[PDB]
Amino acid sequence: FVIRGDEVRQIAPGQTGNIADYNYKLPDDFTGCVIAWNSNKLDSKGN
Amino acid sequence: ALGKLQDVVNHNAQALNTLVKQLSSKFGAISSVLNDIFSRLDPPEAEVQ
């Protein structure tokens, strides 16, 4: 899944926002970790 | 002269009074009411409260 990624603190558990309210909920207790890599140029390209 | 029988009753009554009054102690928390804490605070540290 590809998200804007402008909310680093919201992805980590403990915070919920409007994007969490509507697009995809991010509960305050998530067992998953945060993994990222330098691939913005390839994925990103009106459009 | 019946002070010995009254002493036991007084001790039990004051122990029960202390126990029932201990519920109002804050213990340094935000509030002493569970409902208010749960309503006006999110779980992440309400749990430790």
mmCIF file of C-alpha atoms in Angstrom:
data_model
loop_
_atom_site.group_PDB
_atom_site.id
_atom_site.type_symbol
_atom_site.label_atom_id
_atom_site.label_comp_id
_atom_site.label_asym_id
_atom_site.label_seq_id
_atom_site.Cartn_x
_atom_site.Cartn_y
_atom_site.Cartn_z
ATOM 1 C CA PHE A 1 0.000 0.000 0.000
ATOM 2 C CA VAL A 2 1.300 3.439 -0.985
ATOM 3 C CA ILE A 3 0.513 6.493 1.159
ATOM 4 C CA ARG A 4 1.687 10.111 1.070
ATOM 5 C CA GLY A 5 3.856 9.471 4.120
ATOM 6 C CA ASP A 6 3.775 13.087 5.312
ATOM 7 C CA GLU A 7 2.657 11.960 8.804
ATOM 8 C CA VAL A 8 5.526 9.946 10.280
ATOM 9 C CA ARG A 9 4.211 10.143 13.850
ATOM 10 C CA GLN A 10 0.736 9.002 12.770
ATOM 11 C CA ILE A 11 2.011 5.795 11.139
ATOM 12 C CA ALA A 12 3.582 4.711 14.423
ATOM 13 C CA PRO A 13 1.093 3.483 17.049
ATOM 14 C CA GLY A 14 -0.263 6.004 19.536
ATOM 15 C CA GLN A 15 -1.816 8.599 17.209
ATOM 16 C CA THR A 16 -4.940 8.662 15.039
ATOM 17 C CA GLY A 17 -5.918 11.375 12.578
ATOM 18 C CA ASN A 18 -8.296 12.297 9.766
ATOM 19 C CA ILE A 19 -6.424 9.999 7.375
ATOM 20 C CA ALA A 20 -6.741 7.297 10.031
ATOM 21 C CA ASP A 21 -10.388 8.287 10.525
ATOM 22 C CA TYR A 22 -11.336 7.800 6.861
ATOM 23 C CA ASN A 23 -8.660 6.209 4.649
ATOM 24 C CA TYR A 24 -7.225 3.484 6.902
ATOM 25 C CA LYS A 25 -7.392 3.259 10.688
ATOM 26 C CA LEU A 26 -4.102 3.235 12.607
ATOM 27 C CA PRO A 27 -4.841 2.038 16.160
ATOM 28 C CA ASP A 28 -2.792 3.182 19.136
ATOM 29 C CA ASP A 29 -1.637 -0.437 19.711
ATOM 30 C CA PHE A 30 -0.226 -1.897 16.483
ATOM 31 C CA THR A 31 2.217 -4.803 16.607
ATOM 32 C CA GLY A 32 3.609 -3.997 13.161
ATOM 33 C CA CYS A 33 6.798 -1.994 12.727
ATOM 34 C CA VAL A 34 7.702 0.842 10.364
ATOM 35 C CA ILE A 35 9.791 -0.172 7.338
ATOM 36 C CA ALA A 36 10.805 2.272 4.609
ATOM 37 C CA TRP A 37 13.329 2.574 1.795
ATOM 38 C CA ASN A 38 14.423 5.142 -0.789
ATOM 39 C CA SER A 39 11.937 4.438 -3.585
ATOM 40 C CA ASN A 40 9.999 7.718 -3.824
ATOM 41 C CA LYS A 41 11.590 8.727 -7.138
ATOM 42 C CA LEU A 42 10.578 5.506 -8.904
ATOM 43 C CA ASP A 43 6.985 5.459 -7.634
ATOM 44 C CA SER A 44 6.260 9.188 -7.902
ATOM 45 C CA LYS A 45 5.650 10.839 -11.267
ATOM 46 C CA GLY A 46 -3.370 16.533 -12.857
ATOM 47 C CA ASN A 47 -2.049 12.998 -12.394
ATOM 48 C CA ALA B 1 -16.563 0.390 83.730
ATOM 49 C CA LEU B 2 -17.413 -1.395 80.451
ATOM 50 C CA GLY B 3 -14.577 0.216 78.513
ATOM 51 C CA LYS B 4 -13.011 -3.055 77.376
ATOM 52 C CA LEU B 5 -16.061 -3.995 75.303
ATOM 53 C CA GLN B 6 -16.333 -0.461 73.900
ATOM 54 C CA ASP B 7 -12.672 -0.395 72.834
ATOM 55 C CA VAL B 8 -13.116 -3.274 70.374
ATOM 56 C CA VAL B 9 -16.191 -1.662 68.808
ATOM 57 C CA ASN B 10 -14.421 1.693 68.502
ATOM 58 C CA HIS B 11 -11.336 0.104 66.927
ATOM 59 C CA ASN B 12 -13.384 -1.837 64.376
ATOM 60 C CA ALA B 13 -15.493 1.222 63.541
ATOM 61 C CA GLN B 14 -12.464 3.456 63.012
ATOM 62 C CA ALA B 15 -10.719 0.800 60.906
ATOM 63 C CA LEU B 16 -13.787 0.522 58.671
ATOM 64 C CA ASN B 17 -14.044 4.318 58.483
ATOM 65 C CA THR B 18 -10.391 4.593 57.451
ATOM 66 C CA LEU B 19 -10.853 1.903 54.799
ATOM 67 C CA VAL B 20 -13.961 3.557 53.347
ATOM 68 C CA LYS B 21 -12.336 7.015 53.415
ATOM 69 C CA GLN B 22 -9.211 5.703 51.662
ATOM 70 C CA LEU B 23 -11.181 5.624 48.392
ATOM 71 C CA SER B 24 -11.009 9.429 48.124
ATOM 72 C CA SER B 25 -7.196 9.417 48.017
ATOM 73 C CA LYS B 26 -5.889 10.634 44.662
ATOM 74 C CA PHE B 27 -2.553 8.743 44.772
ATOM 75 C CA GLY B 28 -1.212 11.477 42.489
ATOM 76 C CA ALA B 29 -3.567 10.606 39.626
ATOM 77 C CA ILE B 30 -5.522 13.014 37.439
ATOM 78 C CA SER B 31 -8.812 12.176 39.168
ATOM 79 C CA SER B 32 -10.249 9.704 41.663
ATOM 80 C CA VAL B 33 -13.248 8.836 39.443
ATOM 81 C CA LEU B 34 -12.740 6.008 36.955
ATOM 82 C CA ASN B 35 -15.565 7.159 34.671
ATOM 83 C CA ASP B 36 -14.149 10.667 34.213
ATOM 84 C CA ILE B 37 -10.648 9.306 33.569
ATOM 85 C CA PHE B 38 -11.946 6.885 30.940
ATOM 86 C CA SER B 39 -14.168 9.515 29.305
ATOM 87 C CA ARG B 40 -11.678 12.404 29.127
ATOM 88 C CA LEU B 41 -8.489 10.460 28.334
ATOM 89 C CA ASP B 42 -7.283 7.941 25.755
ATOM 90 C CA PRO B 43 -6.314 4.362 26.754
ATOM 91 C CA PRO B 44 -2.511 4.584 26.203
ATOM 92 C CA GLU B 45 -1.833 6.023 29.679
ATOM 93 C CA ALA B 46 -5.295 5.745 31.193
ATOM 94 C CA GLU B 47 -4.242 2.102 31.485
ATOM 95 C CA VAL B 48 -1.376 3.015 33.816
ATOM 96 C CA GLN B 49 -3.585 5.523 35.658
#
